[PDB]
Amino acid sequence: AELVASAKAAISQASDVAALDNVRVEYLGKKGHLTLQMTTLRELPPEERPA
CA distance 26 to 28: 6
- For 30, half-sphere exposure in the C-beta direction (CA atoms, 13 angstrom radius) is 4
End-to-end CA, the chain = 14
Half-sphere exposure (CA, 13 Å, Cβ side) for 37?
7
Q: What was the resolution (in A) of this experimentally determined structure?
A: 3.0
Q: How was this structure determined?
A: X-ray
Cβ-proximal residues to 14 (8 Å cutoff; 6+ apart), any chain: 28, 31, 32, 35, 36
Please report which residue ranges of the chain form alpha helices under DSSP H: 25-28
